[PDB]
Design a protein around this ligand. Structure first.
Ligand SMILES: [K+]
Ligand SMILES: [K+]
Ligand SMILES: [Mg+2]
Ligand SMILES: [Mg+2]
Ligand SMILES: [Mg+2]
Ligand SMILES: [Mg+2]
Ligand SMILES: [Mg+2]
Ligand SMILES: [Mg+2]
Ligand SMILES: [Mg+2]
Ligand SMILES: [Mg+2]
Ligand SMILES: [Mg+2]
Ligand SMILES: [Mg+2]
Ligand SMILES: [Mg+2]
Ligand SMILES: [Mg+2]
Ligand SMILES: [Mg+2]
Ligand SMILES: [Mg+2]
Ligand SMILES: [Mg+2]
Ligand SMILES: [Mg+2]
Ligand SMILES: [Mg+2]
Ligand SMILES: [Mg+2]
Ligand SMILES: [Mg+2]
Ligand SMILES: [Mg+2]
Ligand SMILES: [Mg+2]
Ligand SMILES: [Mg+2]
Lengths: 51, 99, 148, 203, 193
RNA sequence: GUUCUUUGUAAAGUGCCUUCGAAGAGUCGAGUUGUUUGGGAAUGCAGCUCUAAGUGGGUGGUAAAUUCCAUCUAAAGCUAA
RNA sequence: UUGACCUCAAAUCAGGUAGGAGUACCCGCUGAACUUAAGCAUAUCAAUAAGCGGAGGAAAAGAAACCAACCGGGAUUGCCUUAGUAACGGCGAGUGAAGCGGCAAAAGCUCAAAUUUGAAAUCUGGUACCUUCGGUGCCCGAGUUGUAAUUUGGAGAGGG
């Protein structure tokens, strides 16, 4: 929710809504970066999850 | 399009055996590109209309396409661009409530 | 060669042939084409009638190659044939095996009909032909074939 | 990718979202210094199109340039010449505000090379540009054969010589009949056309 | 300064023309230098004819379309029909022009034929072989000279049919001059309510 | 040229079938102003205002509407003689 | 309370870089007037002198949003022409290109926009060692707001 140039992600909710992909706007590109071993990540996706 | 063999008239020129070269991939720079269509549709749905586009839709619905095209030619460059913009705006109007 | 000029002969004569009364001053009548309408009007009108004003319509971006069309008169019509073959073509003025002359390959665009040609058939390939040129070529038993 | 969406979105500049962002960002740029380092491109897709890469040695600078005409700097409007030269207030500075921006940025970061620049914002007083510069001393640039061309001394201050995109545009460097005056260089063409060529055996 | 009966002259020397006066004193020095450069370039490159094989091509602008001349490079179609790839042709000494297109089978066939002749008259040295020194010939243009195509025969039978070629030209020109007016007249005569 | 290397089941090219084919925006373009050009209802450049499209766009040296055609592919970049 | 992130700072922090000179030629900006027009204001001189910024051994331009209208040519540059011509111009004085053609020299190309996604495969730096215009290992860091590979319209890519 804190991407400093916001145009990078403003179309993401609409893209996810058009393609029927669940999306959540969540606090922290820093938190997503900790998720993916980066400083910031600005997105985090799950395509396959274990059974 | 065949030359007539003489140096004057409509299809003047020498009769040469034609070949029809293979089409260049240029001449298709403004091509269809389903990707562009999808991206442009999404951006058109997330960004709204521009203020002059809103004024143009209003003019189409309240004063007619000739007034709308006059205003669109004043706004954009040329008459061809005005025509295309007015067709796009009335396509928007047709996709709108008057489906 | 300076030793043959009259300025070597004017050495010792004060005015250098330019006169004592009207000397050689800088530009007594103006520079270049000055005063062509005011104090050089007589010299403009005599020896240059038509110099001032406009006479026709303009042509933006004219290309001379569009108008390239060299004219060959009928009076030659045979210098395009090689000298050696010309004698045996003049002899045996046959409607068959008539010499073919590519006037475009020779570098001409229109065949005109000034002179007169011998009474021998010739196949003239040209881009354009004068009416009388074609009439004379046909009267000589030849033909004009249009090319481009 | 997202760069296609960025490119399409940046073309809707009078949409509500881009108008809001334009206002907020123009206020922020006006609050910052006239020339100041930008931490990242404001338009990363535009920077990529103009040759920026997100690696060490690529630098973004934001620059503010005064809008309007070039007033003739003569004292009291007196030009001391013929009336055809008396003009002071409608003279137009045959060089872009973008060129002025990137020249000032290059003078500030003289150790870098101006690769390109792009418009980011404007108000009535100012036009705002982001200048992409390359560090020709950085080893990531001196290697990486795609970019070490700009390390060559022939590319020193190409923004000051008009060798960037806006420089070539203002110099009129384009092909065809519309650019006969300026195809190989205006003054070079003029010298060629005003040279008297005299051979040994005069023609 | 308008004197006696003389043609009006237009000598353009009202600028500082003496600041730009190129006298080609170096014509002979530059010719010697061009010959020296040709010699060292020939010695530098492998036995190789100092220039690329150029295609045959028709000049534009009817002033010159009657003649044929060397072009920039062989078209992609010509190279493919000669059996080469453009990259390999460029490496074995054929100029390739991606811009030029083939709409003339005569020129296309001629260029394919001179490409085949070039391939049959060149020896390509293997990168890891011996290929004994093969007596470099300096000119590919002299080896494969551009020939002007012959169109007709020296003598032929007169086949006059009474068509009056002058009249044919007049009628072609008149048809062009009135094509649009007659087209609009036939547009307005198809009214039929 | 001579010799250790052996690169590498890595890399490249080539035929056919099929689905595609992303191609640069305050930019093009337009108005106006100034300058400039041989460029003349406006050659380039620049300021301000307007501001595109995608079988699109630019050009085709007389402004405009209409219908075609031709030719290239901008708004990013390197390059010896 | 602790740990990040973003942005912004500081250090005589580690390593670098810029300035100035020259300036014949080169790339731009800025920019006259004398002069010519037998006066003079548009024009001319001149898109020149002076002023300013910026390079190299050459620079610039350069692989077509070109020229054309042909039976089509095919990056750029330069020469001979085109041509004192088309055109511009108190249509006055004056100015004034370009296409073709011959020749010199020739050379072609690469990014952006693509999911590597079964594996950031990318790179600066520090350090140890070495065969030191660099290499390897290790370690921080840069980087997913995208660094590699793959493609550049002449194409080309994914599948068989
Ligand atoms: K006298
Ligand atoms: K002055
Ligand atoms: Mg005496
Ligand atoms: Mg005396
Ligand atoms: Mg950084
Ligand atoms: Mg100003
Ligand atoms: Mg492009
Ligand atoms: Mg000026
Ligand atoms: Mg380009
Ligand atoms: Mg360059
Ligand atoms: Mg230190
Ligand atoms: Mg003087
Ligand atoms: Mg005077
Ligand atoms: Mg006087
Ligand atoms: Mg006076
Ligand atoms: Mg000076
Ligand atoms: Mg030096
Ligand atoms: Mg040199
Ligand atoms: Mg260079
Ligand atoms: Mg290209
Ligand atoms: Mg060319
Ligand atoms: Mg002449
Ligand atoms: Mg002039
Ligand atoms: Mg490949």
């Amino acid at each position: 929710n804190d991407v400093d140039p916001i145009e990078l992600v403003v179309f993401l909710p609409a893209l996810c809504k058009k393609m029927g992909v669940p999306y959540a706007i969540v606090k922290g590109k820093a938190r997503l970066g900790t998720l993916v071993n980066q400083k910031t990540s600005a997105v985090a996706a799950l395509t396959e999850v274990r059974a | 399009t065949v030359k007539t063999g003489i140096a004057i008239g409509l299809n003047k020129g020498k009769k040469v055996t034609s070949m029809t070269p293979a089409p260049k991939i240029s001449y298709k720079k403004g091509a269809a590109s389903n990707r562009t269509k999808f991206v442009r549709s999404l951006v058109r749905e997330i960004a709204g209309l521009s203020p002059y586009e809103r004024r143009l839709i209003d003019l189409i619905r309240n004063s007619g396409e000739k007034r709308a095209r006059k205003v669109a030619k004043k706004r954009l460059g040329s008459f061809t661009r005005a025509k295309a913009k007015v067709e796009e705006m009335n396509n928007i109007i047709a996709a709108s409530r008057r489906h | 060669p300076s030793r043959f000029t009259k300025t070597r002969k004017h050495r010792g004569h004060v005015s250098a042939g330019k006169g004592r009364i009207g000397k050689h001053r800088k530009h007594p009548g103006g520079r270049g084409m000055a005063g062509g309408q005011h104090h050089h009007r007589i010299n403009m009108d005599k020896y240059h009638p038509g110099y001032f004003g406009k006479v026709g319509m303009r042509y933006f971006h004219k290309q001379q190659a569009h108008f390239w069309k060299p004219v060959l008169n009928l009076d030659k019509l045979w210098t395009l044939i090689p000298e050696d073959k010309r004698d045996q073509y003049l002899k045996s003025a046959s409607k068959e095996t008539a010499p073919v002359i590519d006037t475009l390959a020779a570098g001409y665009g229109k065949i005109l009909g000034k002179g007169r040609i011998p009474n021998v058939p010739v196949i003239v390939k040209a881009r354009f032909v004068s009416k009388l040129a074609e009439e004379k070529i046909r009267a000589a038993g030849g033909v004009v074939e249009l090319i481009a | 990718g997202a760069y296609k969406y960025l490119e399409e979105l940046q073309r809707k500049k009078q949409s509500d979202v881009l108008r809001f962002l334009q206002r907020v960002r123009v206020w922020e740029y006006r609050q910052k210094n006239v020339i100041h380092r930008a931490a990242r491109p404001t338009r990363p897709d535009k920077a990529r199109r103009l040759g920026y890469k997100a690696k060490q040695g690529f630098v973004i600078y934001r620059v503010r340039v005064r809008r309007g005409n070039r007033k003739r700097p003569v004292p009291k409007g007196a030009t001391y010449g013929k009336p055809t030269n008396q003009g002071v207030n409608e003279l137009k500075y045959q060089r872009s505000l973008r060129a002025t921006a990137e020249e000032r940025v290059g003078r500030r970061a003289a150790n870098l090379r101006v690769l390109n620049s792009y418009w980011v914002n404007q108000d009535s007083t100012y036009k705002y540009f982001e200048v992409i510069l390359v560090d020709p001393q950085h080893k990531a640039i001196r290697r990486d054969a795609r970019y070490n061309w700009i390390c060559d001394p022939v590319h020193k201050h190409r923004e000051a010589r008009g060798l960037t995109a806006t420089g070539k545009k203002s110099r009129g460097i384009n092909k065809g009949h519309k650019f006969n005056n300026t195809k190989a260089g205006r003054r070079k063409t003029w010298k060629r056309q005003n040279t008297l060529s005299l051979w040994r055996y005069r023609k | 300064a308008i004197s006696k009966n003389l043609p009006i002259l237009k000598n353009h020397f009202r600028k500082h023309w003496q600041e730009r006066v190129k006298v080609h004193f170096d014509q002979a020095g530059k010719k010697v230098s061009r010959r020296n450069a040709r010699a060292t370039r020939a010695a530098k490159i492998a036995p190789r004819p100092l220039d690329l094989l150029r295609p045959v091509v028709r000049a534009p602008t009817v002033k010159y379309n009657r003649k044929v001349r060397a072009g920039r490079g062989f078209t992609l179609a010509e190279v493919k029909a000669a059996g080469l790839t453009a990259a390999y042709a460029r490496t074995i000494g054929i100029a390739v022009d991606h811009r030029r297109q083939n709409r003339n089978q005569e020129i296309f066939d001629a260029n394919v034929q001179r490409l085949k002749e070039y391939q049959s008259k060149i020896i390509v040295f293997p990168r890891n072989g011996k290929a004994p020194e093969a007596e470099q010939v300096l000119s590919a243009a002299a080896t494969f000279p551009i020939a002007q195509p012959a169109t007709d025969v020296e003598a032929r039978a007169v086949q006059d049919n009474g068509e009056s070629a002058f009249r044919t030209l007049r009628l072609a020109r008149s048809e062009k001059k009135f094509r649009g007016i007659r087209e609009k007249r036939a547009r307005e005569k198809a009214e039929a309510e």
